Scaffold this active site. Structure first.
Site: not given
Ligand SMILES: [Zn+2]
Ligand SMILES: CNc1nc2cc3nc[nH]c(=O)c3cc2[nH]1
Ligand SMILES: CNc1nc2cc3nc[nH]c(=O)c3cc2[nH]1
Ligand SMILES: [Cl-]
Ligand SMILES: [Cl-]
Ligand SMILES: [Zn+2]
Lengths: 369, 369
Positions: B306, B309
């Site tokens: 994502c 992150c």
């Molecule tokens: Zn993430």
């Protein structure tokens, strides 16, 4: 590669100027508005969204961060830019203005300010904190004289600030990495008194700074008085360096300050008042919580190019703010910061084209209609 | 053009299935997780961010919206999809589950439920509200039997829900535009009792629905009992229609429910617990507020794809949540919804490849290590 610091003026109209500041981490178009990052975030926006609005530089408040996570911790984690994910210039404040406004107890001395959020904030420690954060534009540590001030108290306060400006200069210059990669701005004081403003400008120019802020304004004096003080104060500063009006302000304050020679601005108004339901428009501010917006399918502003105005209605944002929804804060804030950046762009373009006086008149006629 | 509703099963492993639901507003990959939109927003996310996580469909709670702005007002403004800016399928709940949990006072009768937030919510009015919102998947209006329930009370409750399911079917079918463009799901009741679950499934299949939900679970019985009830309940439903487990749940609940034949899920856990500081990871949940994360430069999860992150550390998000910053809620929520979508993708891919049993074992070994 870009220089440490280079301010170039491309066009002028009266006292107004437009140009660029080039720094290692990017170019800043002037006149510039700096969104405010409190606690290492421009509230309710990812940095990419801040950039999408047109911002070239943000102001990083230091007061909260020097307490939590702490400046040493942020340095250990790689600096403020890496920590928050903003890779462009950051101007950091000195931490002292908010110590005075947000601390439980404060004690003033020639050394600095002690406070309980006990800590001592001196000019030397302020410059060090800003270094540890990785600031690009460092502010000298000063005292914002309260308004109103007697001439005696304004003079004593300004004199202390000038001693503190010299200590700030020497601390900054003592740290090779900071001196080579960042810039340092000095702050003029003197309250509303022309002779003290002149003494302060002279002291700052003798020390020498990369840019000069007008301090001590937007502290209760009102626009007429602020503009009167700017009328004589800005010409006292070196013409060839940026002029920064701290904490200003509403759209019409910005326009009038540019007409008086200011190049840089910061204010919490677009972010904080956005979260509270106030949206800026070319026809003046609106309070989106008002029932009149509950079925209004128009965007916040009819001309605004921002993503919020392309995608969502007043009615939806009204619903979100009434409901206390986080997305309401996000959308209001993005629009308001985009509005401020569009204002700055119109200012820059109009100066570049020699039609800024007309822009200021048209702006005011419509904004206050 | 896509059909009103078509569910196709592409692959199977044991009781688990993977496939697609095609509807006018888009394709839904199954097994599917539906992020929850309360008050016309998936809290702290723009719809484009919801989509970036992989969501194909969201659940729109109706309870708040039927009170403010009101269903008629949303219809007048163009429907929920236009209002909130999500153009893909929306499954709406009936409004009754939250009437029972969130209303000050409630009065039950064969006609429906009266409540003070006074209003009557009947099956007919619920279907109408969902129509006015522009729902793509409409839920029949039911009664979620409390747990535990005696056999007598579970039977009486289920029998009323089945009468209400028929009224919901007839109301939906009476409205040509709704019948032609939306789908209707029925909800099985019967508490933990196999004979009542069978009677309920038989009644729902006789009425006929586009999909079948397992109601009455995730209401305090615990995972062992939920799974025991699913073991016998899901096979009672038509195999060729989607099976929706309402209000579930934690990652391991989802995995085990898919192993028992469930195709669709919704839960507030990723959004609500994200705002509270709980992040989901392949190694189990973490509480980002814990001091152990204050200097942790790793992303929330080491494998997660994502945007959160890719860009921000645990240390930064820890700071944001501790500081009460809106960006903390935004980042935690985006990551958690992305984690849930990645879980669903791994489930779908593993079923498609005939290795879902192994995936479930590997998932549990690591998540609970
Ligand atoms: Zn993430
Ligand atoms: C919102 N008004 C306002 N914010 C200010 C911040 C300042 N910082 C340092 N020094 C100042 O004099 C000063 C003046 C200011 N006025
Ligand atoms: C969080 N658990 C949970 N959320 C539910 C929502 C429901 N809606 C309608 N009918 C149900 O039986 C039902 C059961 C549920 N369990
Ligand atoms: Cl703010
Ligand atoms: Cl939520
Ligand atoms: Zn806008």
């Amino acid at each position: 590669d870009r220089p440490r610091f280079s301010f170039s003026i491309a066009a002028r109209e009266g006292k107004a100027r437009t140009g660029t500041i080039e720094m290692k981490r990017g170019v800043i178009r002037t006149p510039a508005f700096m969104p405010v990052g409190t606690a290492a975030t421009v509230k309710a926006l990812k940095p990419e969204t801040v950039r999408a609005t047109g911002a070239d530089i943000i102001l990083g408040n230091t007061y909260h961060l020097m307490l939590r996570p702490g400046a040493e911790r942020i340095a250990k984690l790689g600096g403020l830019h890496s920590f928050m994910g903003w890779d462009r210039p950051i101007l950091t404040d000195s931490g002292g203005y908010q110590v005075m406004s947000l601390s439980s107890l404060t004690k003033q001395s020639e050394e600095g300010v002690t406070f309980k959020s006990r800590h001592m904030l001196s000019p030397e420690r302020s410059i060090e904190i800003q270094h540890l954060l990785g600031s690009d534009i460092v502010m000298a540590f000063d005292e914002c004289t309260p308004y109103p001030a007697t001439p005696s108290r304004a003079a004593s306060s300004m004199e202390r600030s000038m001693r503190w400006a010299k200590r700030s200069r020497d601390a900054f210059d003592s740290r090779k990495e900071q001196a080579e990669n960042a810039a340092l701005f000095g702050i003029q004081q003197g309250s509303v008194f022309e002779n003290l403003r002149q003494q302060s400008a002279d002291a700052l120019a003798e020390i020498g700074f990369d840019g000069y802020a007008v301090g001590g304004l937007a502290v209760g004096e009102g626009q007429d008085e602020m503009f009167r003080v700017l009328d004589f104060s800005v010409p006292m500063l070196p013409d060839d360096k940026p002029h920064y009006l701290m904490g200003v302000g509403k759209p019409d304050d910005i326009v009038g300050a540019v007409e008086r020679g200011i190049d840089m601005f910061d204010c919490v108004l677009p972010t904080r008042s956005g979260r509270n339901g106030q949206a800026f428009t070319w026809d003046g501010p609106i309070n989106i919580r008002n029932a009149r917006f509950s079925e209004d399918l128009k965007p916040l502003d009819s001309e605004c190019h921002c993503a919020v105005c392309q995608k969502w209605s007043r009615a939806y944002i009204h619903h979100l703010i009434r409901a206390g929804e986080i997305l309401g804060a996000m959308l209001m804030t993005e629009h308001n910061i985009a509005f401020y950046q569009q204002l700055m762009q119109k200012i820059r373009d109009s100066i570049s084209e020699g039609r800024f006086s007309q822009f200021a008149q048209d702006f005011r006629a419509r904004y206050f209609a």
